[PDB]
């Protein structure tokens, strides 16, 4: 029998997606406040900025984004090819496994055990655990594909599948490290080579974990919510393969005008610029799908979320290629502008689209026709949008200010500004960003309340069968 979708794991990962969303973005607000008012460091090793920052990072990407990806993929793949999740217990393992990963991050990072490698900061035993859980996840997903009903595989699963495989490769390669003790290892690589492995990994992290996987999300939920057909299947092909191949090359745009050889840097710029097209093929395919049904935007705030999500996605997959130009990076690099780009994509694309996706699926998965209050979905939408825009704005201001002031030369050739002057210049920005992020976070609380209210309603909730 068993021809009822396994909604259990999806349910767990959804709830936990909202929870880690709260925790992670809370952390974000907090460290933002630390940048504004350093006393919030509290002269404690475990609560100082340097240690909390990668906690914000990992919690927000791998815990929030991660759980979003799990819930979404497990729901989406099951319906999009019409069978129960392959090896459902193994999926449950991937749940508790992933939770154990996040909890290990939460304990270990403030405790000071970090590789110092961005988005790969957890030490080797946790990297082993991650590898195991991910292998299991791969088996569950690709297995569910392998035992589908339809002949064709939906493009959403091209993106999901890709994301899974390449994240696995990425993770294993960039975390090759000699263990010294329980929670201390040294990277296999050093210097320029380590930098390149690091940002091949680093960029392709947001490239496949935060772009591809979430394009999968978009490809299921945008058409499903809008109840329109997907525009331009041909585009789905082009944009998918071109993205999947070009994005890997985009590594060196992080290391512009560094000790990394010129040739690599250039390869990175050129391919980052080529990357503009496929990336946009994504948002085109997403938006043109909504054509005709735009009147739904005033009606349905979930759809609002998804669409605006695509707006920010395009904006940052335009900003990115631009900042990947050496002359632009010459100013952008090391400045708050990078962070601005980051959260444009992070709040505006990843967060928005996963929000929308959850607002869609959570009722379904909890045997419920819709969310508790659609009004709160709208107020969430506005809080989150205002927040994102404020964040972006403050970081552009700060970033331009910084780049400019740092390189500012006088008429007699001397440097115009002390670094401390630039630092001081940035404080208003730090505060505005703290407020924007705060507002977004508030929106997340609204989501938490809403979701909770709907979660209350039915203990047996196995509705849907097909």
């Amino acid at each position: 029998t068993s021809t009822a979708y396994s909604y259990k794991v999806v349910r767990q990962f959804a709830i936990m997606t909202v929870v880690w969303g709260i925790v992670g973005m809370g952390l974000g607000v907090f460290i933002a406040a630390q940048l504004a008012w350093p006393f919030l460091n509290f002269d404690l090793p475990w609560t100082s900025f340097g240690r909390l920052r990668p906690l914000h990072t990992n919690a927000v990407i791998f815990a929030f984004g991660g759980c979003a990806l799990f819930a979404t993929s497990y729901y989406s793949v099951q319906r999009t090819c019409q069978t129960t999740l392959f090896a459902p217990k193994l999926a449950a393992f991937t749940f508790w496994g992933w939770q154990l990963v996040i909890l290990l991050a939460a304990i270990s990072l403030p405790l000071g055990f970090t590789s110092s490698k961005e988005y790969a900061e957890l030490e080797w035993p946790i990297d082993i655990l991650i590898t195991i859980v991910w292998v299991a996840y791969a088996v569950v997903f690709f297995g569910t594909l392998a035992k589908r009903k339809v002949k064709h595989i939906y493009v959403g699963n091209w993106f999901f599948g890709a994301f899974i495989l390449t994240v696995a490769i990425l993770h294993v390669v960039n975390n090759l490290e000699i263990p010294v003790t329980a929670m201390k290892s040294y990277s296999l690589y050093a210097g320029a080579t380590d930098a390149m492995v690091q940002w091949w990994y680093g960029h392709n992290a947001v490239g496949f974990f935060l772009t591809a996987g979430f394009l999968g999300i978009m490809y299921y939920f945008v058409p499903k919510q809008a109840e329109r057909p997907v525009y331009s299947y041909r585009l789905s092909i082009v944009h998918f393969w071109a993205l999947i191949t070009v994005y890997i090359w985009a590594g060196p745009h992080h290391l512009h005008y560094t000790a990394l050889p010129d040739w690599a840097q250039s390869l990175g710029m050129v391919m980052s610029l080529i990357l503009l097209a496929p990336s946009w093929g994504g948002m085109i395919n997403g938006m043109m799908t909504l054509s005709g049904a735009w009147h739904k935007l005033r009606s349905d705030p979930i759809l609002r979320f998804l669409v605006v999500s695509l707006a920010f996605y395009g904006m940052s997959t335009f900003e990115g290629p631009m900042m990947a130009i050496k002359t632009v990076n010459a100013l952008s690099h090391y400045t708050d502008w990078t962070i601005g780009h980051v959260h444009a994509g992070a709040l505006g694309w990843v967060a928005m689209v996963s929000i929308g996706a959850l607002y869609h699926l959570v009722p379904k998965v909890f045997g419920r026709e819709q969310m508790h209050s659609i009004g709160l979905i709208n107020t969430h939408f506005w809080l989150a949008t205002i927040g994102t825009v404020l964040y972006i704005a403050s970081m552009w201001v700060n970033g331009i200010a910084q780049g400019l002031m740092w390189r500012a030369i006088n008429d007699d050739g001397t440097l115009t500004y002390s670094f401390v002057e630039s630092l001081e210049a940035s404080h208003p920005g730090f505060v505005v960003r703290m407020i924007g992020g705060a507002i977004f976070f508030a929106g997340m609380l609204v989501m938490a309340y809403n979701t909770w209210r709907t979660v209350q309603a039915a203990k047996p909730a196995e509705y849907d069968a097909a």
């Binding site: 735009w294 605006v308 631009m322 002359t327 632009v328 952008s332 780049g403 500012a408």
Partner: peptide, 29 residues
């Protein structure tokens, strides 16, 4: 403010982002 080639590149990049966003944003109305 101090004006350089690089500063100009940055400024028009940000401006272009404002333009893209504004265009898209009003395009959604």
């Amino acid at each position: 403010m101090f004006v350089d080639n690089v500063v100009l590149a940055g400024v028009v990049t940000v401006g272009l982002m404002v333009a893209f966003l504004a265009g898209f944003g009003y395009f959604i109305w």
